[PDB]
């Protein structure tokens, strides 16, 4: 529980675009609720939307060997849950990512965060 604050220059994220992909709705809702709770505890606002799924179906034969009459329907889903943040120090963002990844749902609930640095000029 030490700040360990130094005097070196840090990076500042300009509009942290965040997006979470997930198949079903229950796991995605749990993940988004956890993320919103963490953000409120940190002190950042968010905004969500209602996008559709991604129908990437791939059909193949039903039987493993002969027979081709009837095929099989296999496909995966994904719902985009945008929770972009705004303004946050590099260390704070790193700690946030660490806390989110220490218990990220494997497979389902895939995170897609897009950082936007600045890099000081000459």
């Amino acid at each position: 529980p030490v700040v360990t604050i130094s005097d070196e220059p840090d990076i500042l994220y300009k509009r942290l675009s965040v997006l979470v992909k997930g198949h079903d709705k229950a796991v995605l809702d749990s993940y988004e609720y956890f993320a919103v709770l963490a953000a409120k505890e940190l002190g950042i606002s968010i905004k969500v939307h209602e996008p559709p799924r991604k129908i990437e179906r791939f059909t193949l034969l039903q039987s493993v060997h002969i027979y081709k009459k009837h095929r099989v329907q296999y496909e995966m889903r994904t719902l985009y849950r945008c929770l972009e943040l705004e303004h946050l120090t590099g260390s704070t963002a790193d700690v946030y990512l660490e806390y989110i990844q220490r218990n990220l749902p494997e497979g389902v609930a895939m995170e897609v965060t897009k950082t936007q640095l600045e890099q000081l000029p000459e």
Binding site: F58, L60, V64, V72, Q73, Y74, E75, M76, G107
Partner: protein, 101 residues
């Protein structure tokens, strides 16, 4: 420790094809070209032909992974749907399941 010999065939083909690629791409680019007469083009053709057999991605046949079963195999998953279909039925695949719509 592969099942059938076609597995070793394809493995050796892939290995000998991935061994060299820089010269292959260079000669492929030099081929289709209006610049420089056909002299250097034919020279590069003979050079690329001088390479030994096997060492060529053309001989690579994208089969399965169990015992080489090119029957509706998914290159994204490599292995055929022998066990993959079993998992999709049970539910060991995070998402890939029966299209419930």
């Amino acid at each position: 420790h592969y099942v059938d010999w076609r597995m070793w065939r394809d493995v050796k083909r892939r290995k000998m094809a991935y061994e060299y690629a820089d010269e292959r791409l260079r000669i492929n680019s030099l081929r289709k070209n209006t610049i420089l007469p056909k002299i250097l083009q034919d020279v590069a053709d003979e050079e690329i032909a001088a390479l030994p057999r096997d060492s060529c991605p053309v001989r690579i046949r994208n089969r399965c992974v169990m015992t080489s079963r090119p029957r509706g195999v998914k290159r994204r998953w490599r292995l055929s749907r022998i066990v993959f279909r079993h998992l999709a039925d049970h539910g060991q695949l995070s998402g890939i399941q029966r299209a419930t719509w």
